[PDB]
Amino acid sequence: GLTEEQRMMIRELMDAQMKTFDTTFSHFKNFRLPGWSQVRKDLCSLKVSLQLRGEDGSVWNYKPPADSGGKEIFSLLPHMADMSTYMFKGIISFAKVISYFRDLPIEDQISLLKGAAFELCQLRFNTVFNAETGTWECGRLSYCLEQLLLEPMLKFHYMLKKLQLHEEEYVLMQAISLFSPDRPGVLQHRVVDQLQEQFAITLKSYIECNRPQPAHRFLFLKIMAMLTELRSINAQHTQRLLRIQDIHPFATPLMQELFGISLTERHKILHRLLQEGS
């Protein structure tokens, strides 16, 4: 079985997830709505329609335009920036209530969240992804996709959903991604690296104590391979986001902070959120 400290480690991560992940998206408000070639082709694969279900029973449905070559390909990017910002704020709170993360220097806290923001966001998105309908079910909001598995982020969501992970395995993936000692700007490398290794050992122990079926053979090494793949997808899409923001500005002030290539000065919003409570 799991050791006591591993039991406590999982318990703290799960408690953090429950306290900082609003799976109903009920507090997502005041978002915007609709009024290089490799990017355009990739943006075509991820084309989604937006459905908003009101409490009264009504449904607003947005179908995106077709690719005509103009600025029509970015009609949903302002909205997704507001959704990404809301999602990241939950990620910040998730990290803040973790004991191992809260004790790191403030700049390493900034650097870790900066390097893992997209990765923990995609991990939480996967838990609301419906692989049958191709829809991310975000409470009252739904995002339904329109060979398309060629796109890496799309392929990632299908591959990860196929593993049928438990909540504990998702939250341990989040901790492994969060405590990456090789993020730019990290100073406490050995401290963060020692923390990451214990999360990975905890995940391996959890899988062996709860997943005996042959369908879950090599599941731990599959998860670690998925985490390395997600870090690659992070680099591609962050770089892709900078090109788009250059051409058509869409990023919220908090997102611009993530995209900037002193530490607390360049990240005033993230710095304030790390100092605020919950």
Ligand X SMILES: CCC[C@H](C)Oc1ccc(C(C)(C)C)cc1NC(=O)c1nnn(-c2cc(C)ccc2OC)c1C
Which of 168, 179, 178, 181 has its CA nearest to residue 220? 168
63 touches its own copies (CB under 8 A): yes
144 touches its own copies (CB under 8 A): no
Query: In this chain, which of 237, 244, 245, 256 binds ligand X, going by CB under 6 A?
Result: 237
Query: In this chain, which of 9, 13, 16, 77 binds ligand X, going by CB under 6 A?
Result: 77
Residue 46's binding partner among ligand X, its own copies, none (Cβ under 5 to 8 angstroms by kind) is: ligand X
DSSP track, 151-184: SHHHHHHHHHHHT---HHHHHHHHHHHHT-TTST
CA diameter of the chain = 59
Question: Could you tell me which stretch among 60-68, 153-161, 198-206, 267-275 binds its own copies (CB under 8 A)?
Answer: 60-68
59 touches its own copies (CB under 8 A): yes
Question: Which ranges of 64-163 would DSSP assign to H, the alpha helix?
Answer: 77-96, 99-102, 106-126, 152-162
Query: In this chain, which of 23, 24, 61, 133 binds its own copies, going by CB under 8 A?
Result: 61
202 touches ligand X (CB under 6 A): no
Length of the chain: 278
- The footprint of ligand X on residues 123-152 (CB under 6 A) is 125, 136, 138, 143
Q: Are the C-beta atoms of residues 117 and 91 closer than 8 Å to each other?
A: yes
Q: Are the C-beta atoms of residues 75 and 29 closer than 8 Å to each other?
A: no
Is 125 annotated in a binding site? The answer is: yes
Which residues contribute to the site for its own copies (CB under 8 A)?
33-35, 52-66, 68, 70-72, 75, 140
